[PDB]
């Protein structure tokens, strides 16, 4: 399935392209509903798809970007407030923070060490497998890093955040790729 962004999940201080496949940073920000399914205190979106099963793909570009979380998340998880994205709370992301520091939401944090920084980023769900794989694929298509036996009981998300407003400092897009 061709993943699209969830125009109802979306934090205001994002903007998302009428094809639903790009995200960015706004420089305000919107005034839209407070509906139940958005995220209100981060620069968060989801994917439409709801996954229940099978293996799922998608590719992420990155390019310019000082800082992003991709991943995937449980259908379930809570939208209002602060909150920490671990698997405890239904999140399998990695990061990027500071233009320079990798990390995958393992507890405690696990640091990856990328010699070649992503312009973009493959991401694989295998649901039966209880896998989340990341990919360089700047870096001919090496592995970040995969979380393994998440043993999945629901329905899952794509996971996306362009970032956290940063004067202007992280203003490129998200972008998914065909
Ligand atoms: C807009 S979320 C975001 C956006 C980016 F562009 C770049 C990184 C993040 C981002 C990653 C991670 C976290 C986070 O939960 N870290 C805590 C650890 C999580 C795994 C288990 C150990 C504790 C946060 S947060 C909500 O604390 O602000 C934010």
New binding site residues.
């Given amino acids: 399935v061709h993943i699209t962004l969830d125009p109802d999940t979306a934090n205001p201080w994002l903007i998302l392209s009428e094809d639903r496949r790009q995200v960015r940073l706004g420089d305000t920000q919107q005034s839209i509903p407070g509906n139940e399914e958005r995220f209100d205190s981060?620069?968060?979106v989801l994917g439409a798809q709801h996954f229940h099963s099978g293996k799922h793909y998608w590719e992420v570009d990155v390019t310019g970007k000082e800082?992003?979380?991709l991943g995937v998340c449980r259908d379930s998880v809570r939208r209002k407030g602060?909150?920490?994205?671990?698997s405890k709370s239904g999140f399998w992301?990695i990061?990027?923070?500071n233009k320079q520091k990798y990390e995958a939401?393992?507890?405690?944090?696990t640091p990856l060490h990328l010699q070649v920084p992503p312009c973009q980023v493959g991401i694989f769900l295998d649901y039966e497998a209880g896998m989340v794989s990341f990919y360089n694929i700047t870096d001919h298509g090496s592995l970040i890093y995969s979380f393994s036996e998440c043993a999945f009981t629901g329905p899952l998300r794509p996971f996306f955040?362009?970032?956290?407003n940063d004067g202007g400092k992280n203003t490129a897009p998200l972008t998914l790729c065909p």
Avoid: K
Avoid at 105 to 109: N, S
């Fill in positions: 981060y620069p968060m800082a992003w979380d602060h909150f920490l994205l671990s992301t990061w990027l923070w939401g393992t507890y405690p944090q955040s362009p970032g956290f």
